[PDB]
Structure 1
């Protein structure tokens, strides 16, 4: 007689990435970058109408 035990294949998920611009919400945002935030300390808009 023989007697083995078996690992019969294993299956992993493939987790997905999301670009936020590859999503319908980003028409409500303006994705604009600013590489020197941490010294900016303030901001404003004086809004003439």
Structure 2
């Protein structure tokens, strides 16, 4: 026997994730990641408060 072996890509697995690789490592614990905008708003009101 050989523990069952034909490869990485034979049904359906890679979107728990997306990616970016990360080789060089050795610097973070609880760093950042961003974006820079927010969520829809104001042209129904009165002349609202």
Q: TM-score range by the shorter chain?
A: 0.3 to 0.5
Which structure has more relative contact order (CA 8 Å, sep 6+)? It is 1
Query: Which protein shows a greater Rg?
Result: 1
Higher helix share: 1
> What's the TM-score, normalizing by structure 2?
0.38
> What's the TM-score, normalizing by structure 1?
0.38
